[PDB]
Design a protein around this ligand. Structure first.
Ligand SMILES: *Cc1c(COP(=O)(O)O)cnc(C)c1O
Ligand SMILES: *Cc1c(COP(=O)(O)O)cnc(C)c1O
Lengths: 449, 452
């Protein structure tokens, strides 16, 4: 069977390989709109838009035709050694012109992981160029997600990405997860919590030596880490501390980018003025692997000078700016703008968050959080202590399983069940997401007894 | 704003002097068909490099394009996380395992060769932690090897251009000698004696560092980006003996050699390598889609699988890992290579290419002609006795590549080596035209130098 071939031949990401050999895969055969279907014909609402990525859903014919048109023109070329092609140029123009702060240049990669890995290299290159060879350390947050390369998994603050992999590398430092529900002191306001987090960062900078800190990287809100919305004034106060010590501010917009948070960028929603932005996922509705780094004028000018001194910029992926991936991403961004999907997502997000808020006084619901069209419900075994049932992740695993039985694919991040549906979701579809959540919660409540 | 002006304004180019780019602007490629690409001025070029040694089936294979369409209209994205799967990833993994030149267990997909080698580093660290060998973590690679551009894979890479200014390599990424007889053999040393000395260098490096601390040796069977460096006779035999002696994994980076480049399906077959791990990309999809694949053997899989159970799940994966459109295109690509007998065809075309270039073997500027199958390089020198460059190293290569472009052919210079890596579908007349355009560039370069 196809399931037997999968067990025989494929090592799965983010999977227990031994349990996989026993249970085998859930094979997804086809998709349309917000739905995917398994090889048994069962339909599921993809309430996660795959990996928070399939902005236009699973059957956008404009994207598919844009791919075809580019395939029949030039199915591959590269950007190395002054070579270029129209789709990379037009996408770079569109990204610079839509940027929420003045940006200078785009550098393309295949993945968010490659993009953040590239940012690490470009910052080291820059500070070598500027004659600041000590100015190399990165600061990220506990539970931040920045990808899975040796370097980007060192930026990542999730233990699952580091345990067994000898990470983080030296020079990749982590400050606190800005989650008020878990880390605020008894009776501390969001603004007081923000103050204390800004103090933690400043103290980290001073303890390490300000001259040794190159950059601070953060997702405007933390996606994979559990839909962690930072406290009011966090980004204002963190940026003050960064500007104080000449530290680059990198906005990882891989999840927030292109209308997820109710504005085009999380940087807009949270008032971030980044030096560098990283984009992926919704950039192409994941129809093609592509990511993009936006760098501002000072970062470009330093890198450009050093590329002249060293002969050429000694960095690039075969797939960097791939003409089919860039053609698809260009068409994707045009549809998001033409169909007013940022404002549509914002409206659908209000319906999603209001629907979930009906469950705020349920005995297993610890917290409901989110912004725009991304949300999470954190389940607890006890609301007073905020303790898990059995161990962190038991409730989340059972909930996600019940949601799948009720025809909805959701992701558990510990005991948080996440929602990140396609931007094209309609009002009754939001209603059906909340209904399938409710059925899964009922099942989980009966199970915990 | 012209398209060239927008490119200068908005794009930071890989492997480009950004300041020179602001002055010269791009060469914009508009379209392609068969072995040809055309710039925005309508000038046609034979893509004698198949882009980046990658476009196996040329620039207008309609079967690949229809395979993409069919998959887009079925399922345009899904992932492989948390037991999820899809038919194209499964069928491609089956095809790759069943065609492997040694017994392999599992495939892990990535978007790029760089991600794939970066993943191999993580998987080897994970494996040796799983086996209770926490010290067994260092990698050995070669000077002028190319393994990609991430912080870790650029540490494996042995090309200075990939490390200078980037604070690389990381600690625990060690480099032994480039196996290029022409450049690094002692005066009057045989290929076999050179191979012995390189195997001694490796063993001495292993002993100096502590054998218990060395996890893996990674090499391209033949070194592509480093100048089409064919290892000396007996090199891979003797290196593998040293590796097996100290329980060091052998990783074959087949990103260029994979899928018929060297006259057999894999460079591991051509060079008699029995790797534990293979890395594949580029020709896997004819670069029509970004995809790479790691093949791991049974012992590597079993160790990783044990630890993934203990830790709850394997904490690694890319959004695009096994992308259904990329895997669908790669599957159709490998079917065409098998159905059209392109491995045997490439072997035949490579003999014509090498024979055509060898008409110039006693030219005063030709130092060496090297290659296997349908990959070749001509290394130009200013002086055949000393092997010294004309002017600075790289002058002849840059001049030749420029003249080739004027004569309607895209070649890559690696220092003073001019490389050939054409699409596998190149026909006999087209090989003739590649050698003719090389000859016109060489004539120009010879008139420019005046060796008299
Ligand atoms: C998805 C993700 C990444 C990694 O992207 P990949 O394409 O899977 O390598 C990086 N940052 C954030 C915020 C992410 O959500
Ligand atoms: C192309 C290349 C790589 C890097 O592949 P990318 O997809 O560009 O990241 C790795 N190894 C070898 C031998 C290569 O030629």
């Amino acid at each position: 069977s196809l399931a037997e071939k999968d067990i025989q031949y494929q090592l799965h990401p983010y999977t227990n390989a031994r349990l996989h050999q026993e249970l085998g895969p859930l094979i997804i055969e086809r998709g349309q709109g917000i739905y995917v279907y398994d090889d048994q014909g069962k339909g599921y609402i993809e309430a996660m838009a795959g990996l928070g990525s399939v902005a236009l859903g699973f059957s956008n014919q404009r994207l598919i035709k844009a791919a075809e048109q580019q395939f029949n023109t030039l199915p591959f070329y590269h950007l190395f050694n002054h070579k270029s092609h129209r789709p990379s140029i037009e996408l770079a123009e569109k990204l610079i012109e839509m940027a929420p702060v003045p940006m200078s240049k785009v550098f393309f990669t295949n993945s968010g992981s490659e993009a953040n890995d590239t940012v690490v290299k470009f910052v080291w290159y820059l500070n070598n160029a500027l004659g600041k060879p000590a100015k190399k350390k990165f600061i990220s947050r506990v539970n931040g997600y920045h990808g899975v390369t040796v370097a980007s998994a060192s930026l990542t603050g999730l233990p699952g990405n580091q345990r067994g992999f000898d990470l983080p590398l030296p020079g990749f430092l982590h400050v606190g997860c800005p989650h008020h529900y878990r880390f605020a002191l008894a009776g501390e306001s969001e603004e007081h919590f923000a103050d204390r987090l800004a103090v933690e960062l400043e103290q980290k900078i001073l303890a390490e030596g300000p001259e040794t800190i190159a950059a601070f990287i953060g997702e405007p809100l933390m996606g994979a880490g559990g839909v962690i919305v930072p406290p009011r004034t966090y980004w204002e106060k963190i940026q003050k501390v960064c500007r104080k010590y000449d530290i680059l501010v990198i906005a990882d917009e891989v999840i927030c980018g292109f209308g997820r948070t109710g504005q085009m960028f999380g940087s807009q929603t949270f008032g971030i003025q980044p030096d560098i932005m990283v984009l992926s996922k919704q950039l192409s509705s994941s129809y093609q692997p592509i990511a993009a780094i936006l760098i501002n004028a000072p970062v470009f000018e330093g890198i450009a000078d050093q590329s002249q001194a060293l002969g050429a910029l000694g960095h690039g992926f075969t797939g960097s700016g791939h003409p089919v991936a860039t053609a698809v991403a260009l068409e994707n961004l045009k549809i998001i703008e033409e169909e007013s999907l940022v404002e549509h997502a914002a409206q659908m997000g209000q319906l999603l968050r209001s629907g979930l808020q009906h469950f705020i006084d349920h005995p297993l619901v610890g917290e409901i959080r989110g912004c725009g069209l991304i949300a999470a419900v954190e389940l607890v075994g006890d609301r007073v202590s905020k303790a898990p049932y059995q161990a962190l992740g038991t409730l989340g695993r059972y909930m996600a399983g019940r949601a799948q039985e009720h025809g909805m694919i959701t992701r558990a991040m510990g005991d948080a069940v996440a929602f990140c549906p396609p931007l094209i979701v309609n009002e009754q579809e939001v209603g059906m997401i909340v209904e399938r959540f409710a059925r899964a919660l009922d099942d989980t409540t009966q199970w915990v007894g």
